[model samples]
Target chain A: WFFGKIPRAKAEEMLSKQRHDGAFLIRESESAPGDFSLSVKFGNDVQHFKVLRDGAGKYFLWVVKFNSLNELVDYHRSTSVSRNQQIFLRDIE
Target chain B: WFFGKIPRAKAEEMLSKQRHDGAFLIRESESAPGDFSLSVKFGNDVQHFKVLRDGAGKYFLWVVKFNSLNELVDYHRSTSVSRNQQIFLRDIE
Candidate 1:
């Protein structure tokens, strides 16, 4: 089951992009370079698309950085259903 | 990486119920009738759970209807993390 907000088309598209499992890469957006966009690269093809939810709903996204050992070392750039709301980093694990 | 509010126990429980993949179902609640509960069916097993998050953040759940090809046709009875807020869906796709 999927929670929160994600583009239906993008979600389905990402499904096709999945490898043997569900994993993908997403970019912030065009305006924010250092920030990630509302798109995820699916499967091994790494295809990207716009992720959106119609009408008014709760939605969010974030940027994460992992260590060489593949451990999440840090994260930044997060947004919620509200427009232009960016949350800062506070913890890591 | 996964983001937002999800009960640690429930999330883990849902994972186990998931088929060979991440697809699953969720139920809304018992008090709610004609309302979609927050539960999902994955693979062949039906697992119910409560998905939540900790801290001040945005989170939500919805009742979705699917047509042929498993195309989502409609949704209803959604909630966000504002104490007690519910939203009604209007479109089907």
Candidate 2:
């Protein structure tokens, strides 16, 4: 979770190796000024998402603000998230 | 098949909407100086491939060469190709 900083191409290469669905990790964003991007592996490919932080620092995918980035991730694991596909993240192993 | 001169970002956007496995199209390549790329939608993402034409004027992906690009694609339709995944191409209909 403390992936300090890495570019998008590097991120994909790291995730691509596993070829597992719902496989993901949080990384510091270079594409955005914000803190993170959620890179998920599914369907022999990857889906990249930006986690936004509000003015008061609550993190979320949309408008569902959570206290911290970890909390937001926990919510998804406790539940499931995504674009017509259920995404449940597992750390790279 | 006549989608000409489009960039990679534009390619993904068009393919992303389908969200169907094996959904693909042949497009004019901007990444490679050669003619085309196989943009495939699998999982919830896309895999892009460059169609290579050799100096002998035969087209290929790697080792297999065919008299025409259409022949090479026909071979795949008769079989399957990949990187630990079976990729079968389909027109973007």
Runs in model 2 lying further than 4 Å from the true structure = A64-93, B1-93
lDDT for position B59 in model 1: 29
Evaluated at residue A41, the lDDT of candidate 1 is 29
Segments of candidate 1 deviating more than 4 angstroms: A1-21, A31-43, A60-93, B1-93
Docking class of 2: incorrect
Q: Every prediction's TM-score for the first chain? A: 0.25, 0.59
Q: Which lDDT tens digits does candidate 2 get at residues A2-76?
A: 356877788788777754454555678886565677665657776666655544444544333344334544454
**DockQ score of the complex predicted as candidate 1:** 0.02
Q: Estimate each model's TM-score.
A: 0.18, 0.33
* Model 2 TM: 0.33
Q: Predicted candidate 1: interface RMSD?
A: 19.5
Worst-scoring 10-residue span by lDDT in model 2 chain A: A84-93
Q: Each candidate's lDDT (Cα)?
A: 0.32, 0.54
Candidate 1 per-residue C-alpha lDDT over B1-93 given as tens digits, one digit per residue, 9 for 90 to 100:
232244445644655554443233333334434222233333454344333322333222212222311122112113221113222222212
iRMSD of prediction 2? 24.9
